[PDB]
Design a protein around this ligand. Sequence first.
Ligand code: 3PH
Ligand code: 3PH
Ligand SMILES: *[C@@H]1O[C@H](CO)[C@@H](O[C@@H]2O[C@H](CO)[C@@H](O)[C@H](O)[C@H]2NC(C)=O)[C@H](O)[C@H]1NC(C)=O
Ligand SMILES: *[C@@H]1O[C@H](CO)[C@@H](O[C@@H]2O[C@H](CO)[C@@H](O)[C@H](O)[C@H]2NC(C)=O)[C@H](O)[C@H]1NC(C)=O
Ligand code: CA
Lengths: 458, 200
Amino acid sequence: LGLISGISIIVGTIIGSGIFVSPKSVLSNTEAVGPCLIIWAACGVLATLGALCFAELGTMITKSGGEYPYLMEAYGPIPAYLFSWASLIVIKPTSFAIICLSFSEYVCAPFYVGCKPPQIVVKCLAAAAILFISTVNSLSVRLGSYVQNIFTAAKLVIVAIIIISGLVLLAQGNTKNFDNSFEGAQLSVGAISLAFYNGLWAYDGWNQLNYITEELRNPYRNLPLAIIIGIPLVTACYILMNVSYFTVMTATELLQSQAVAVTFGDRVLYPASWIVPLFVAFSTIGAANGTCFTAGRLIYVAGREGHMLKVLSYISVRRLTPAPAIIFYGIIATIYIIPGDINSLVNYFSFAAWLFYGLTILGLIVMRFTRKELERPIKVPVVIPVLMTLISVFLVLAPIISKPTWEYLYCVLFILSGLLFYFLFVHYKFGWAQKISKPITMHLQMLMEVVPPEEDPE
Amino acid sequence: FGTMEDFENLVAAIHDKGLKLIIDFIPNHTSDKHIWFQLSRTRTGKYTDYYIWHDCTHENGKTIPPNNWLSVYGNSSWHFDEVRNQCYFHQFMKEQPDLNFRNPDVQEEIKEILRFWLTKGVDGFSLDAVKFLLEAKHLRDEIQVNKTQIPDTVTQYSELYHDFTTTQVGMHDIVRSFRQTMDQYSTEPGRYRFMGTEAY
Ligand SMILES: CCCCCCCCCCCCCCCCCC(=O)OC[C@H](COP(=O)(O)O)OC(=O)CCCCCCCCCCCCCCCCC
Ligand SMILES: CCCCCCCCCCCCCCCCCC(=O)OC[C@H](COP(=O)(O)O)OC(=O)CCCCCCCCCCCCCCCCC
Ligand SMILES: *[C@@H]1O[C@H](CO)[C@@H](O[C@@H]2O[C@H](CO)[C@@H](O)[C@H](O)[C@H]2NC(C)=O)[C@H](O)[C@H]1NC(C)=O
Ligand SMILES: *[C@@H]1O[C@H](CO)[C@@H](O[C@@H]2O[C@H](CO)[C@@H](O)[C@H](O)[C@H]2NC(C)=O)[C@H](O)[C@H]1NC(C)=O
Ligand SMILES: [Ca+2]
């Protein structure tokens, strides 16, 4: 991989299902077109400054996991344990639930042309996509990656159709909706901070660019150069897709819409309007098939320290798959869609994710005073992790001060539920702990035929 | 009522509150100051058959009409034009000459007016006086309600049976072709175009 194929993996990773669901909720909180395009550009700066700080932490430590070896080196075991606990029950199953809910919005929308589908149909189709992907990835480990490259080709084509056909309409003079773009707006701290939750969901994947883009021809120079080129170029493709939405829709017509890109393909591509519900539905289960490849990597490295159960990250003897972890993620993601509702799972996801993005980037500054003499090949200027940890407390405190809903209580109580399990199973190892953990591991071993992975740390 | 910019600001403001807008449409007749009628009575081009013209015997201040047909507001429905030296038909008033809907150039001009307002963003139309669209081309006299009445005193509209001037064969097909013109602007979901007719 050179430099050009280094920035191509960055563009393919960061373009996901977010740009097809998020424009409604950014406009719902900043009610004008003008502020709606500033938040889409300011989210691409938070993704670029955030990925640069993770690029320094990735070369300084050089250990597998996620943010788990980064938090242990800075604070110790207690924030490292809470990240392994919150990524098990909060972060990873909600990400699997938002994607499978976004798949069922785009299948059910062309059948209910001028009205909404009922909530029983979008939820019973989303649960059928969770249980289909959780069994396909639990049987046929290599089948998920043969279809993975035609699911990325279907994603970039339908993005390039919307961008190009929007610049053609912009040249003909369909620019009336941009005329008064700053009249009627919100400088409330809860309207802007939730508009940042939905824009930054469309950039999901900037914190895992380290592990796959460090097998390059010349690292420590081409990795921070692929981030400065790659993530601002997807920021240009996200602004140009919102510009294309506002050539055929008013800001009121976009709020009164079920899926935003079906409404685009119904006013532009008229005799072939079904290609937009077809290509987005392919690209969305490909984004859910891709998150089941990663099942078991953090669970293995957290269980090696005693911070996670060891019956998870076991491997099936036939069909060599991480079957106890894939089944565990499919069960919690199915529970999450019964209360359901994208715009209520994105707030639940972004509150726990940005609490631990903020603790990790703060650990970059703590390790500049505590963990010197540690050979940093990449070294960002100090003003970049300071701004990224000041926005990270603005994105945590401002929804729970100004617009408090019930998900910010159910997310805090699920993270502090793990702090009880630290002090009974890790810090104060008692007697009754391992005689619950060992018969459960023994009986789930004969049920699923799963063994320890004949392996080493790597 | 304002300008065209005042209308375009009203359509945008109506849509921003979730409302819809339907307007009236008058297909049956124009004014005598319309540019089609000023070219019709000089026999200019294709406009010669845009209105219904027939010969008559107007001399010393009185016209002899081609039949006994009456206007709705009540006198003869034929009025003599001095430039054309013929008589034209009108269902309502002498300042409202009727369009000739047996001419396919007239029906194409009406479809361009429908496409003009649907492009501006109007959500529908109410069609007025659709039963007065076609008349019988045999031009025979109506039947009087009172058959012993002398025909020089029959001047009120309620004194004739209007079998040849309302609801003729082919009138419902003209209304159905208007519905097909608006169907090209209704293929988008949520932007169906309404059509209502007023026949009282
Ligand atoms: C209401 C809120 C709570 C809801 C809880 C609902 C629980 C329902 C469990 C449903 C499990 C469904 C499993 C079947 C999915 C098959 C997916 C697949 O492809 O498998 C391939 C895999 C391949 O096998 P092959 O066909 O032999 O190749 O097949 C299986 O592994 C089937 C084994 C079923 C696994 C069941 C796991 C259930 C674990 C429950 C443990 C509970 C312990 C609690 C103890 C607490 C003590 C304090
Ligand atoms: C196939 C899917 C099922 C298989 C995987 C799940 C296992 C099923 C049983 C679940 C746990 C049963 C009780 C705990 C038993 C072990 C306790 C212990 O002493 O740990 C020692 C354990 C080490 O045991 P070792 O693996 O034997 O070394 O220490 C820890 O791992 C500390 C971390 C505890 C992690 C707890 C994980 C809880 C999973 C269930 C979460 C429930 C909430 C779901 C979401 C709410 C609704 C949305
Ligand atoms: C046509 O109808 C008009 C009514 O608008 C008649 O004109 C005059 O009507 C008033 C009543 O409002 C009478 O007092 C006048 O005597 C009418 N004028 C004349 C000259 O008689 C008119 O008579 C009707 N007929 C014609 C042929 O014009
Ligand atoms: C209208 O019809 C009537 C009968 O259908 C005609 O005859 C008149 O009828 C009334 C009824 O009582 C008599 O009082 C009159 O003597 C009749 N003769 C007349 C008015 O000459 C009548 O002629 C018809 N025409 C009009 C204009 O009324
Ligand atoms: Ca007529």
